[PDB]
Design a binder for this molecule. Sequence first.
Ligand SMILES: CCN1CCN(CCC(=O)Nc2ccc(S(=O)(=O)N(CC(N)=O)c3ccc(N(CC(N)=O)S(=O)(=O)c4ccc(OC)cc4)c4ccccc34)cc2)CC1
Length: 282
Amino acid sequence: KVGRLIYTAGGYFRQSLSYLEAYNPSDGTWLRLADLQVPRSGLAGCVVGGLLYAVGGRNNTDSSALDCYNPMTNQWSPCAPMSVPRNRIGVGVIDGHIYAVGGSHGCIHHNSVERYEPERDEWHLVAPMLTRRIGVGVAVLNRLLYAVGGFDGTNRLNSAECYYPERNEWRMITAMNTIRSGAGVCVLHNCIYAAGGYDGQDQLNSVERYDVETETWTFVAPMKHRRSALGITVHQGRIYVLGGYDGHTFLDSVECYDPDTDTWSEVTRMTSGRSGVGVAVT
Ligand SMILES: CCN1CCN(CCC(=O)Nc2ccc(S(=O)(=O)N(CC(N)=O)c3ccc(N(CC(N)=O)S(=O)(=O)c4ccc(OC)cc4)c4ccccc34)cc2)CC1
């Protein structure tokens, strides 16, 4: 069997893409899957019940689209769209529900947040963030959604806030050491990781993880390639970053961070360089 792959949807390189490819870290092999009905970039990926969802993005135009991919049918299926278009959206999953955080619709910078129930194919607004954030990293940890960095329309941000589903409220948390938009955010071993991003003048290769109990952000081993608008995911206790923009070119490099050795390896290259891809694991 081919159990658990890293899926990449959409992206940008000279134009919005429709590519859907999968990577087998047991293999080193790539798989070409069904193209997206509409090419998109700046979207987010997540998994719920073994289906892969592609949320938001822009087609070259800002998308409110939610689309479902079934790995067993290799087929894409449209879902109820969001209430608003959300370019540079962040996404997280709590109890089988997809939270769409922030993003832009043209020049509107959203601080709003909606929740999608796959059981009912319905979207509902939840409490809005304290800060408008596009290009925001999103991570779920102890059933709490975290919104990290991004751009509020005026300032690139280093702040972070925390949404509480049971109370339906947001609370700021400790700010990061660096301003980061278009960063990869994920959760590896009870910690939130924030890799790369763009600090307003440079693409970053730095990496800080947040310890919730100590409330502090500490830097860790940096990546080899500066990159923003990167895909990120966690597979078997390791972080994977995919593609992105380094300020000049569109990367195809996929680096793998080992927490037990605090080291970034290059483990493969995408079939072509791209940025703004959605990434998930199933
Ligand atoms: C128009 C005139 N020019 C001038 C220069 N050009 C340079 C050549 C070029 O094409 N770069 C390029 C790079 C990337 C894409 S993208 O697909 O990933 N993408 C598209 C999307 N869906 O919006 C996105 C763009 C910007 C983002 N950022 C958040 C933010 N507020 O900018 S960011 O922090 O990471 C950033 C900031 C400054 C940077 O340096 C300028 C580069 C990154 C995105 C964040 C998340 C997801 C997609 C993003 C697309 C194009 C091109 C065109």
